[PDB]
Amino acid sequence: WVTVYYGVPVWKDAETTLFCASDKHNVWATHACVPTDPNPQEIHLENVTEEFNMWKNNMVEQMHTDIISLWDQSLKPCVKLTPLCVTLQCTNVTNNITDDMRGELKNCSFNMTTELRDKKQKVYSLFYRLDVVQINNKEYRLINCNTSAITQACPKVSFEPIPIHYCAPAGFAILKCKDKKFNGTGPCPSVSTVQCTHGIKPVVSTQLLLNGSLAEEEVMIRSENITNNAKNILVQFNTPVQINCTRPNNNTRKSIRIGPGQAFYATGDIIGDIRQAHCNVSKATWNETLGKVVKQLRKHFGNNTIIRFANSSGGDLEVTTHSFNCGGEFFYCNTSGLFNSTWISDSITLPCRIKQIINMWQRIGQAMYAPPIQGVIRCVSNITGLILTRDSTTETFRPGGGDMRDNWRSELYKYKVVKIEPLGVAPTRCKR
Amino acid sequence: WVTVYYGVPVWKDAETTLFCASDKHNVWATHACVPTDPNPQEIHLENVTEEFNMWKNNMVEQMHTDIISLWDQSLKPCVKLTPLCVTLQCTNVTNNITDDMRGELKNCSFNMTTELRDKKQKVYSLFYRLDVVQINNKEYRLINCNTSAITQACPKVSFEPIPIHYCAPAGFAILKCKDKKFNGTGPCPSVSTVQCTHGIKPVVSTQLLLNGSLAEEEVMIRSENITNNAKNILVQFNTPVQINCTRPNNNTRKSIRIGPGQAFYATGDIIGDIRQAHCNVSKATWNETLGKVVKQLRKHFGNNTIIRFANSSGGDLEVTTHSFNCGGEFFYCNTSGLFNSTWISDSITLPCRIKQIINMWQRIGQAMYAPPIQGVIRCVSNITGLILTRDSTTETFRPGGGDMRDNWRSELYKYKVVKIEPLGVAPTRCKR
Amino acid sequence: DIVMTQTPASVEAAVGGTVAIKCQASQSIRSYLAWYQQKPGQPPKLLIYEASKLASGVPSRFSGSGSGTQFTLTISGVECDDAATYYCQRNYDSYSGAYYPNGFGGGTE
Amino acid sequence: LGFLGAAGSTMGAASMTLTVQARNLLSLTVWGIKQLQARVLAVERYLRDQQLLGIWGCSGKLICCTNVPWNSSWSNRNLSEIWDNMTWLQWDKEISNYTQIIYGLLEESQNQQEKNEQDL
Amino acid sequence: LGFLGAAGSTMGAASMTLTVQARNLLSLTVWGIKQLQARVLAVERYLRDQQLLGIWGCSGKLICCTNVPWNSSWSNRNLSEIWDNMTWLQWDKEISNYTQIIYGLLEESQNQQEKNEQDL
Amino acid sequence: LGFLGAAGSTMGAASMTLTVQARNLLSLTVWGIKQLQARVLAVERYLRDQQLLGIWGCSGKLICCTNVPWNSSWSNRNLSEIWDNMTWLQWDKEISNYTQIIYGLLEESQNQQEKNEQDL
Numbered sequence A, B: 001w002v003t004v005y006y007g008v009p010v011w012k013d014a015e016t017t018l019f020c021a022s023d024k025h026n027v028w029a030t031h032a033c034v035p036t037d038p039n040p041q042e043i044h045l046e047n048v049t050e051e052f053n054m055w056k057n058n059m060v061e062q063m064h065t066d067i068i069s070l071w072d073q074s075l076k077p078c079v080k081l082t083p084l085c086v087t088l089q090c091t092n093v094t095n096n097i098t099d100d101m102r103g104e105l106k107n108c109s110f111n112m113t114t115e116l117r118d119k120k121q122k123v124y125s126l127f128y129r130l131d132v133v134q135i136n137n138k139e140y141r142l143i144n145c146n147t148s149a150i151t152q153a154c155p156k157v158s159f160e161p162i163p164i165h166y167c168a169p170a171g172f173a174i175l176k177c178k179d180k181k182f183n184g185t186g187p188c189p190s191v192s193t194v195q196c197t198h199g200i201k202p203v204v205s206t207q208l209l210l211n212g213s214l215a216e217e218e219v220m221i222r223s224e225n226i227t228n229n230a231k232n233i234l235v236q237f238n239t240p241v242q243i244n245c246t247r248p249n250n251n252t253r254k255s256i257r258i259g260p261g262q263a264f265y266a267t268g269d270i271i272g273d274i275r276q277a278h279c280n281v282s283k284a285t286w287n288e289t290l291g292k293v294v295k296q297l298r299k300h301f302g303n304n305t306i307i308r309f310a311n312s313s314g315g316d317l318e319v320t321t322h323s324f325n326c327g328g329e330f331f332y333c334n335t336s337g338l339f340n341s342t343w344i345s346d347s348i349t350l351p352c353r354i355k356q357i358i359n360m361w362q363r364i365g366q367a368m369y370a371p372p373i374q375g376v377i378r379c380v381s382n383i384t385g386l387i388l389t390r391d392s393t394t395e396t397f398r399p400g401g402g403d404m405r406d407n408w409r410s411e412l413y414k415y416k417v418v419k420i421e422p423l424g425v426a427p428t429r430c431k432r
Numbered sequence C: 001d002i003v004m005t006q007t008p009a010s011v012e013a014a015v016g017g018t019v020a021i022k023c024q025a026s027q028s029i030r031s032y033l034a035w036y037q038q039k040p041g042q043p044p045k046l047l048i049y050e051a052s053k054l055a056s057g058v059p060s061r062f063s064g065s066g067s068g069t070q071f072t073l074t075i076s077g078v079e080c081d082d083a084a085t086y087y088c089q090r091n092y093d094s095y096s097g098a099y100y101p102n103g104f105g106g107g108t109e
Numbered sequence D, E, F: 001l002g003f004l005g006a007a008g009s010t011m012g013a014a015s016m017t018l019t020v021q022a023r024n025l026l027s028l029t030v031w032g033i034k035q036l037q038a039r040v041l042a043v044e045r046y047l048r049d050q051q052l053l054g055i056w057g058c059s060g061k062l063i064c065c066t067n068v069p070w071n072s073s074w075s076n077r078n079l080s081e082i083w084d085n086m087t088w089l090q091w092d093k094e095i096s097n098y099t100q101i102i103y104g105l106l107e108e109s110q111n112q113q114e115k116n117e118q119d120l
């Protein structure tokens, strides 16, 4: 009566280790990743359903620890700048500036070690205001002198995002859901199977989500709990909004030897006038896109609810501004110029600041020093979504953001990992 | 005629790699150890015998190298104290002391590096006499300045023992012998099989064996060779002897920054009077326990042999005193108050010293600095056995000890690792 | 791929009586069935969407319900303005994941 | 249909795709060490399934029939209903809690027939 | 009796526990890397035993009978004595030094019967 | 002759050395980590070949015969020529580009005969 079958098409939810596939020694060691399967076959599954939960998806946790581990490994074999944490003697940069840049740059002189242990040299460099702390012309310290070590990033290792594909080991499969009305949880009927996902760009940002995937059928609004004001709301656009960012100053760079075999890259002088860094967003596009978000957002509050976007909530720059990583520079842009409307029933210019000393993972640990880059940086990118948080007829939303194990969460919401279980039994009418 | 059988219950002696199972980032990385099998099944083997040799047991060698490797890995990502090896200017601590502590603590001032490379600060701290060496008030060096590097142990990593279970890989099995009269070598008939052993606490000590397993049927005395005076004798009690140890002084601690992101923990001042560290053992319990050891020890010498325990043999503290690791402090206690009797036909107080610079594995290599601990330490522990060495009617025994690849040897004596060999053949009366 | 069959063909009733029209599918289209009314010479008017919701401009005599693979359109009473055929439209594509108005079954008065 | 193409299909019909699923079960930086973990895991899982089929006397077959009787208490259904009106995912849930019973019976029943070859 | 429960038992009686032992043969810090060593070793040993059974024509069986004659010089004993009055540990010691002879004979004798299927 | 001793020999004659080659297929410093790579690779390759033989119904045999017809378009030669006047290296080159055809036919033809046991 008992017949044993092998190769039965069933599975259980499971957690396993995923490995990557992809495609000059960049920050994510993509040359160490296996080659992709070109033209992989996607297999649609007819007459199946499955349940998903993007807020409990362990693929997010692996992407989180993979990116952090890679960041730290890549910065490990790089020159330390410990000898640079000295008393600095600084004055203001005033010779060729606009008023908006007055006080933004400082000219600092200091006594630094030469390759010979017994000799010192007088050198100077420029620093941005945000990296320099006054002690009492005036004496200064770098911002991390009493908190952590500063390591200079290696100049040969780039940071631009490179798509990384996550692949399951044999015996496991990835279920991708196509239901275009899926809100992040529960039954999601249009399921297909892939062995390895498409590439995801490991972009790190706050408030605005850049260079991600787009929605199609509608703007999607997803949250763990809509009525819980302690949770974030992820909004995915079905159209991109284009932005253009610039340095715009023409920078120079010089090397200082600080010991045998090691050098520090100092910001040199500036060619031409000094102007403030900034980002432009097309105004009409932003105006229309925001209206689409509101129409859809109202479905969870009522047709008589007024939606206001107020302003940024306040706090440290890392959580109040738009953290933008581009061209090898770290930008902190003022988004109050975007989120300024109330909804009832040209270009926008966002002034932006630059920092060289970066605490990338919002932790106390080794800080990275971004070496200066010569020439002029020009960045073009797509806003694919945004993060909102919510504070009796008017609801208030704010950019919020700042959370890690987010952003990537908007790319991995479509996937679940399952374990294949080939054996099973059933009754029939045979005997040996 | 030839029949081949698979799954035949036979084995050969073998050596393989064992892995652990167990159960806050402690020194043995127990969070990296796999979970245990709850309520594991022990299987008694009827009508078998096996031979064991605890002196040739390779499980001891693996425990030895696992503990050392873990110790070194755990202390690796910790602040180095190299900048502390400076000329110290010291005076005696005299303000609130008893006579027994006169000269035990010194008050040392020194010129140490601040987070800025170009600034120095005058700081002071207290040190124990045993960690400070006079050069020529008076000038001093730390004990390891001309021998090794000093690394401060990380304050978040605890040292109390945590049971570790050793598990065999599939295809291997561990044979545990229950013969309660087993002397460490030869046939041991009461054999049972387990897949993984019970937990063993990685306690490091000398002279007295603390928090181990107990004997039952009798006090067991084991040695590689009883008549060889170059060998140690391990004595396992069938009852615990309780001891209570104390700091007893109320200590404070302060942090000194010694460079960006790094700090040294200095012993601060002392609240209340300064008294000598000490351990108490119940006297009656010690008196009775020692008599039991003698009765059994005599069986290997004769009923007309007198047994004397003399005193400690002399040498460096690490091999003459009771090395005791508890509360995060390192104690070196005087055991001459215990081993003081001759056997023919209240509490005991043992004065004890404290050191902060520890050469844990009796090797020249990196030394560990134990940071100060605030408040008052109180330790309670079980003496489960002891180590004796032996020097014409009187035999003399002394605490001896000091050997590594010992202590754990008293926990692993019960186990042997074997390899399962499922194939074999035999004649019968069948053909194809 | 898409199977939609309207079965109670050629049903009519006198004014004041009632009628019902029903459709079946070989694939579930839970809550994604739309009903239309087509009077001669006119484009179809949307009556009911998402199985049971009435479209704006639709009289209260129209109703309906269903789930899965079984759905019905009902008229609470004939008012002599029912001179139309009715159609079933599927608003869910099981292969693409999209929810657009692809595929009809129908033709019953 | 492709790998798991039959997952939503009738249990009977799905028996003809057993080859397709079986065919796809077997295979110091961040993206480096994970590949030893990925490969060791794939191998161990493959072998455990083969080991059970070997023990039960099903080596070399996608479909094997044995002499263990069906105990109706495991599922009070007829054959027409499970083979024609149910999928494998549904069936697996229905009798998942008897898996260990069936497996113990299947292995004992194999050894009982090996001793019977002592006579040939 | 449990795993190796029959180790001290009569060779004949112990044949009924072959399932029990077979069933238990298959599966960058200090306690980390040792697990790849533990798993790779378990897999290789399992597979080598299966490979030999495959080569000798014993695939899928705990007990297999072949046509190789017994050479009495390997052990001058009758069957009553080894099957009723001896354990497997004892037997293994007695003929351990002929293992390589038996295995060579067993594999050659299998290939010699594969060529005989050239006629079917 | 020894391992690969028959590599230059006639295809027919070489069939009697299949045992010899099969027998030898299965098994943090610079010379350290390479051994996990060496062992994992040896195991995966061994198992993939065994998996295919299992699927085609050839488990446990060095030589297995199946019911798939020979399509002469793959090689327009008679049997006398390939078995007596050719080596295996030469044969492998001649039909290397049909390997995937033969394998697909071999596996489908096995499942088609498993359903036929539904009647026993």
Ligand SMILES: *[C@@H]1O[C@H](CO)[C@@H](O[C@@H]2O[C@H](CO)[C@@H](O[C@@H]3O[C@H](CO)[C@@H](O)[C@H](O[C@H]4O[C@H](CO)[C@@H](O)[C@H](O)[C@@H]4O)[C@@H]3O)[C@H](O)[C@H]2NC(C)=O)[C@H](O)[C@H]1NC(C)=O
Pocket: A158, A159, A160, A161, A203, A210, A211, A324, A325, A326, A327, A328, A378, A379, A380, A381, A382
């Ligand atoms: C969102 O996606 C867009 C599109 O991919 C992305 O914009 C692109 O960024 C790259 C990298 O910053 C730009 O490439 C540079 O172009 C300049 C001008 O020709 C070159 O000089 C640069 O070469 C130097 O830097 C290299 C990297 O360190 C060195 O290897 C090289 O030797 C030189 O020193 C480099 O080629 C690219 O032009 C833009 N594309 C557009 C249309 O602007 C954007 O950055 C993404 N968003 C985010 C947040 O990353």
Ligand SMILES: *[C@@H]1O[C@H](CO)[C@@H](O[C@@H]2O[C@H](CO)[C@@H](O[C@@H]3O[C@H](CO)[C@@H](O)[C@H](O[C@H]4O[C@H](CO)[C@@H](O)[C@H](O)[C@@H]4O)[C@@H]3O)[C@H](O)[C@H]2NC(C)=O)[C@H](O)[C@H]1NC(C)=O
Pocket: B158, B159, B160, B161, B203, B210, B211, B324, B325, B326, B327, B328, B378, B379, B380, B381, B382
């Ligand atoms: C032999 O076994 C005994 C029994 O297990 C063992 O004695 C125990 O030692 C631990 C650790 O020293 C004691 O636990 C402490 O208790 C005090 C008082 O409440 C706490 O303040 C301590 O907390 C601090 O330290 C922790 C570890 O660094 C920190 O994580 C924490 O945040 C605090 O800073 C700690 O809980 C325990 O009380 C005793 N038990 C008894 C009965 O005394 C003995 O040490 C073992 N022998 C040897 C040689 O180890």
Ligand SMILES: *[C@@H]1O[C@H](CO)[C@@H](O[C@@H]2O[C@H](CO)[C@@H](O)[C@H](O)[C@H]2NC(C)=O)[C@H](O)[C@H]1NC(C)=O
Pocket: A093, A094, A095, A107, A124, A126, A269, A270
């Ligand atoms: C930062 O300060 C230095 C030192 O005063 C400036 O460099 C000097 O520039 C003058 C010309 O204006 C030269 O004659 C000197 O020889 C330069 N000195 C050195 C040491 O190079 C520098 O221009 C200032 N930078 C900015 C942005 O103001």
Ligand SMILES: *[C@@H]1O[C@H](CO)[C@@H](O[C@@H]2O[C@H](CO)[C@@H](O)[C@H](O)[C@H]2NC(C)=O)[C@H](O)[C@H]1NC(C)=O
Pocket: A211, A240, A380, A381, A382
């Ligand atoms: C910004 O959005 C546009 C529009 O989707 C992207 O352009 C498309 O890129 C894909 C992939 O190469 C092409 O198949 C489409 O045909 C392009 N569409 C158009 C209208 O040109 C563009 O790549 C996005 N930018 C970034 C940085 O992601």
Ligand SMILES: *[C@@H]1O[C@H](CO)[C@@H](O[C@@H]2O[C@H](CO)[C@@H](O)[C@H](O)[C@H]2NC(C)=O)[C@H](O)[C@H]1NC(C)=O
Pocket: B093, B094, B095, B107, B124, B126, B269, B270
């Ligand atoms: C170690 O020496 C220091 C320095 O003399 C002592 O600290 C001083 O204590 C007096 C009070 O008795 C204060 O007025 C001073 O301001 C303290 N000086 C500093 C630098 O703190 C310290 O008490 C001595 N420690 C011991 C144990 O004797």
Ligand SMILES: *[C@@H]1O[C@H](CO)[C@@H](O[C@@H]2O[C@H](CO)[C@@H](O)[C@H](O)[C@H]2NC(C)=O)[C@H](O)[C@H]1NC(C)=O
Pocket: B211, B240, B380, B381, B382
């Ligand atoms: C010191 O010895 C006592 C006596 O054996 C230990 O107390 C026993 O602990 C076990 C395990 O928890 C219990 O099952 C017994 O019932 C306890 N016996 C008594 C009389 O209470 C005690 O744990 C030992 N101390 C240390 C540090 O190991």
Ligand SMILES: *[C@@H]1O[C@H](CO)[C@@H](O[C@@H]2O[C@H](CO)[C@@H](O)[C@H](O)[C@H]2NC(C)=O)[C@H](O)[C@H]1NC(C)=O
Pocket: A046, A047, C026, C027, D008, D009, D010
């Ligand atoms: C999904 O379910 C439908 C039934 O609701 C299946 O359709 C049947 O297919 C068989 C052939 O396998 C036909 O004989 C029946 O007449 C069909 N039923 C109907 C109502 O038309 C469909 O095959 C299933 N999909 C899959 C992949 O198995």
Ligand SMILES: *[C@@H]1O[C@H](CO)[C@@H](O[C@@H]2O[C@H](CO)[C@@H](O)[C@H](O)[C@H]2NC(C)=O)[C@H](O)[C@H]1NC(C)=O
Pocket: B046, B047, E008, E009, E010
């Ligand atoms: C250990 O040896 C004894 C014999 O000394 C075994 O006892 C025999 O068991 C069989 C059944 O298996 C009985 O028929 C005999 O009559 C028993 N002999 C005697 C003298 O009573 C015992 O079974 C062996 N233990 C194991 C686990 O095999």
Ligand SMILES: *[C@@H]1O[C@H](CO)[C@@H](O[C@@H]2O[C@H](CO)[C@@H](O)[C@H](O)[C@H]2NC(C)=O)[C@H](O)[C@H]1NC(C)=O
Pocket: F008, F009, F010
């Ligand atoms: C190499 O090729 C030669 C032929 O050129 C083989 O010699 C033949 O061997 C068979 C026996 O296997 C004899 O019956 C023939 O008569 C021999 N031919 C000649 C011309 O003498 C030789 O055996 C081949 N070597 C190997 C290893 O196969």
Ligand SMILES: *[C@@H]1O[C@H](CO)[C@@H](O)[C@H](O)[C@H]1NC(C)=O
Pocket: A092, A094, A103
């Ligand atoms: C430099 O900047 C400070 C503000 O931080 C301002 O008070 C001071 O006047 C400036 N000095 C010069 C010369 O502009």
Ligand SMILES: *[C@@H]1O[C@H](CO)[C@@H](O)[C@H](O)[C@H]1NC(C)=O
Pocket: A087, A089, A109, A110, A111, A122
């Ligand atoms: C370098 O050291 C000298 C010491 O006399 C000091 O006068 C000078 O100001 C220091 N220069 C800088 C740039 O710190």
Ligand SMILES: *[C@@H]1O[C@H](CO)[C@@H](O)[C@H](O)[C@H]1NC(C)=O
Pocket: A133, A141, A142, A143, A144, A145, A146, A147
């Ligand atoms: C010094 O530490 C304080 C926090 O205690 C911090 O606010 C300040 O910015 C630090 N300054 C420097 C130069 O590290």
Ligand SMILES: *[C@@H]1O[C@H](CO)[C@@H](O)[C@H](O)[C@H]1NC(C)=O
Pocket: A183, A184, A185, A186, A222, A223, A224, A225, A226
């Ligand atoms: C998603 O939709 C389901 C109904 O299909 C609902 O129960 C669930 O609460 C929704 N989730 C969120 C986050 O709104």
Ligand SMILES: *[C@@H]1O[C@H](CO)[C@@H](O)[C@H](O)[C@H]1NC(C)=O
Pocket: A244, A245, A246, A278, A279, A280, A347, A349
């Ligand atoms: C932003 O727009 C202004 C005109 O309002 C223009 O002068 C500036 O160059 C633009 N900046 C960028 C980065 O496009």
Ligand SMILES: *[C@@H]1O[C@H](CO)[C@@H](O)[C@H](O)[C@H]1NC(C)=O
Pocket: A242, A243, A244, A280, A281, A282, A347, A380
């Ligand atoms: C960005 O620059 C391109 C030219 O390179 C221009 O066509 C585009 O309109 C600019 N986008 C915005 C938002 O200004």
Ligand SMILES: *[C@@H]1O[C@H](CO)[C@@H](O)[C@H](O)[C@H]1NC(C)=O
Pocket: A287, A288, A291, A340, A341, A342
């Ligand atoms: C642009 O924003 C204003 C509010 O500032 C709003 O009234 C207007 O409708 C918006 N335009 C579009 C196209 O959404």
